[PDB]
Amino acid sequence: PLESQYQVGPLLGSGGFGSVYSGIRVSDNLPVAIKHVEKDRISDWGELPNGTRVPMEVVLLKKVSSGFSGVIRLLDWFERPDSFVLILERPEPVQDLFDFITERGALQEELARSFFWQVLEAVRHCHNCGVLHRDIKDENILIDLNRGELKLIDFGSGALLKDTVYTDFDGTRVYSPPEWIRYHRYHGRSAAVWSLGILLYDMVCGDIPFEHDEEIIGGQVFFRQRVSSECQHLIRWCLALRPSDRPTFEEIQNHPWMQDVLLPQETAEIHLH
């Protein structure tokens, strides 16, 4: 049916991810996002069990799209002659973390603790469903401002999780780890932890630590804001130059800086409402 199932509103944005529109499901007035990807631009394809050939993003989304609210849910999708159309959740009111940090500057550590913990829980979900996101960064994290819940979006650079090396990458370079920069090689989990250190720095300092390749591979972390010694230690650990020296998610979540996290609703009440 298509445009009889959804009322299409204004363009939300466009780019390497395609074109996304604000929308509404006619039946129950659910707010949704409608994402158009050209077939000519899809680099990675996969298949659903029944042999239907789809973009990898749709495979990845179906693997993670089960109830847990830390990841954006794919509600439906459609194939057209020259494109696919994806229908996704849209929180309302919503603000992406990039926008939020631009607006507020460096976050208080209590708030960055809640946000970062929620991102950790969301990435563990992905990994347990067999999915590596590969483009974790402030822009790809939406804040449901009423609930205080963070959601991960855009699995368009993602891959199936595997234990062997990756030699391809189409995410954001300034969140990519030094082994990618030097050797065009990385492993999934240790690369993820590096990008989380970039994200945590970004949260507590209000900008990312490295802009150029030379900075990425040099691994000197200079703090431009006041950041507690515990928080600096977690960041520096995630940003270890040698992959095997980086923490596991368990080690991250057992770190002293990560104890006594606020709940999402408390986060919303204290910091968002």
Side-chain angles (χ1 to χ4, degrees), residues 1 4-39 41-47 49-210 212-273:
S4 73
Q5 284 201 70
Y6 301 90
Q7 198 189 78
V8 190
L11 182 64
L12 284 171
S14 82
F17 53 92
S19 300
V20 176
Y21 293 84
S22 181
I24 295 292
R25 188 160 59 189
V26 182
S27 72
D28 58 5
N29 300 335
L30 188 72
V32 298
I34 305 173
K35 180 185 197 170
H36 291 261
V37 187
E38 291 206 38
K39 286 194 204 184
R41 292 168 77 270
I42 286 163
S43 184
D44 286 25
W45 296 78
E47 44 158 1
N50 55 22
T52 321
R53 192 166 145 89
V54 294
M56 195 54 70
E57 175 176 3
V58 171
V59 176
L60 302 186
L61 278 165
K62 292 168 93 74
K63 287 171 87 33
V64 304
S65 285
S66 291
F68 177 72
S69 74
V71 181
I72 209 68
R73 273 185 40 147
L74 181 73
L75 302 167
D76 205 342
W77 62 276
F78 299 90
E79 179 178 4
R80 285 165 169 192
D82 292 305
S83 68
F84 287 87
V85 191
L86 278 63
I87 312 290
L88 299 143
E89 293 182 308
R90 172 170 67 84
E92 191 189 61
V94 68
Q95 181 170 28
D96 73 71
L97 181 57
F98 171 87
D99 209 63
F100 183 89
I101 288 171
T102 298
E103 195 152 291
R104 293 217 183 177
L107 310 181
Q108 298 174 208
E109 284 183 35
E110 182 179 67
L111 184 55
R113 177 179 304 113
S114 170
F115 282 6
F116 189 62
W117 184 272
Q118 291 189 46
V119 178
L120 281 162
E121 288 287 315
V123 174
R124 288 174 62 195
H125 175 78
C126 289
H127 289 198
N128 292 143
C129 297
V131 174
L132 188 63
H133 182 287
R134 293 206 293 188
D135 197 28
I136 299 155
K137 60 170 170 184
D138 53 7
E139 286 188 66
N140 291 339
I141 297 174
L142 303 180
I143 310 164
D144 178 334
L145 295 173
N146 280 343
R147 295 188 164 283
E149 287 171 14
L150 266 64
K151 314 201 118 53
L152 194 53
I153 63 170
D154 195 12
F155 288 77
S157 317
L160 294 176
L161 187 60
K162 69 188 188 189
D163 290 314
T164 54
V165 68
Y166 290 86
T167 63
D168 58 313
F169 181 68
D170 199 43
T172 312
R173 192 164 181 93
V174 293
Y175 286 75
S176 71
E179 61 272 17
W180 166 250
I181 299 296
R182 278 185 182 286
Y183 309 117
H184 301 143
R185 291 164 69 85
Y186 61 95
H187 289 71
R189 295 166 178 93
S190 54
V193 167
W194 168 279
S195 78
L196 288 163
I198 298 293
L199 180 72
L200 183 46
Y201 185 99
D202 187 51
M203 285 182 208
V204 300
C205 290
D207 205 351
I208 54 175
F210 314 125
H212 304 123
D213 297 354
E214 288 77 16
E215 295 166 322
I216 297 181
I217 69 183
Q220 271 294 331
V221 182
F222 160 95
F223 289 82
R224 67 186 82 194
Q225 299 276 324
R226 178 48 206 210
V227 175
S228 70
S229 301
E230 310 226 276
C231 188
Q232 290 198 17
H233 174 277
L234 181 51
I235 292 166
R236 289 197 163 98
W237 195 10
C238 295
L239 290 186
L241 287 176
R242 295 185 52 215
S244 59
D245 288 339
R246 300 176 196 152
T248 59
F249 300 139
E250 183 172 14
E251 283 169 315
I252 294 181
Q253 290 185 295
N254 287 327
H255 194 275
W257 187 73
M258 293 258 69
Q259 304 314 294
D260 307 309
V261 73
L262 295 174
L263 302 170
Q265 202 61 243
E266 293 171 339
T267 303
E269 279 169 8
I270 300 166
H271 290 293
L272 305 181
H273 291 153

